[PDB]
Write a new protein. Structure first.
Lengths: 124, 197
């Protein structure tokens, strides 16, 4: 199952493996046990180039995990500034609330990510 | 029973991360995502990162245990070979028979299960340091995969369990391990074999 392999390749940041799997049509919207897509996993780990290739390939920028987080939630929570910018450019929803009622902005505030919180507020 | 190896991310969304260490001639620990397999040299530092989607509560513990990967060997306890068990190389915390050690943590505990006789090593879970995304544990593997009195060329898995203070399951992940002289060469060889099969 190529979707399962793409999830792990994206999580571990193996750019060559990501390219081979996508060249074989691995499902870019596959989900892991927590409902995370390859885009969620690359956003969480901070793999900017993998985020970018997934966005050029029709990954759902606003897919939600089992806790209601989008990839932008993860990037805002853990402080991935460049990834926040590319997700916003690709149409990430700044108003999406997770199952704790938090937007990406709220997660940026809660985690002390001041520059990202400013970027998200200007995009509100 | 035979220890479970099933991935269970659980309520805390537990994943493992590893460094990007490559396949150079002198590399001491390297992880292949395509094989889900760590290649490392005997006694060298093997960083394993704990990534959680939410912080498990104080009192959570992190256990590591080795099992044989092949079904016909899975019921045999993974132990160090007699030569290495007798070579007087304990750090003063690890029993000399245990394959897996943790370095750099004075709160480590080593367990010999009274019923299954399996070995494991457990540390308290601590959240990431300020500015850090993950919690790192430094493991050491104390025999080569090829040790004839021990693993005797049989592949093993390491199972990492997040547990509550009572030992109840919170999350589980696993990876194959080869302990060898030349982890970079062997990673490159096994990745080539996989790409050809
Ligand atoms: Zn040995």
């Amino acid at each position: 199952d190529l979707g399962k392999k793409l999830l792990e390749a994206a999580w571990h940041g193996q750019d060559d493996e990501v390219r081979i799997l996508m060249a074989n049509g691995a499902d870019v919207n596959a989900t892991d046990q927590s409902g995370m897509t390859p885009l969620h996993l690359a956003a969480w780990r901070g793999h900017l180039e993998i985020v970018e290739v997934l966005l050029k390939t029709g990954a759902d920028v606003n897919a939600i995990d089992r806790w209601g987080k989008t990839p932008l939630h993860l990037a805002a929570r853990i402080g991935r500034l460049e990834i926040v910018e590319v997700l916003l450019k690709a149409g990430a929803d700044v108003n999406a609330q997770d199952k704790f009622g938090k937007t990406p902005f709220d997660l940026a505030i809660d985690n002390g990510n001041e520059d990202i919180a400013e970027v998200l507020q200007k995009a509100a | 029973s035979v220890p479970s190896q099933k991935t269970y991310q659980g309520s805390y969304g537990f994943r493992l991360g590893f460094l990007h260490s490559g396949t150079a001639k002198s590399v001491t620990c390297t992880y292949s995502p395509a094989l889900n397999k760590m290649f490392c040299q005997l006694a060298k530092t093997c960083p394993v990162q704990l990534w959680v989607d939410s912080t498990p509560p104080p009192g959570t513990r992190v256990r590591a245990m080795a099992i044989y990967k092949q079904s016909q060997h899975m019921t045999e306890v993974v132990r160090r070979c007699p030569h290495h068990e007798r070579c007087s190389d304990s750090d003063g915390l690890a029993p000399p028979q245990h394959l897996i050690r943790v370095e750099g943590n004075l709160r480590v505990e080593y367990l010999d299960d009274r019923n299954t006789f399996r070995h494991s090593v457990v540390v308290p879970y601590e959240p990431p340091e300020v500015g850090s995304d993950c919690t790192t544990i430094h493991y050491n593997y104390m025999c080569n995969s090829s040790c004839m009195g021990g693993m005797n060329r049989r592949p093993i898995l390491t199972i990492i369990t997040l547990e509550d203070s009572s030992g109840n399951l919170l999350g589980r992940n696993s990876f194959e391990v080869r302990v060898c002289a030349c982890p970079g060469r062997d990673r490159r060889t096994e990745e080539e074999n996989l790409r050809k099969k």
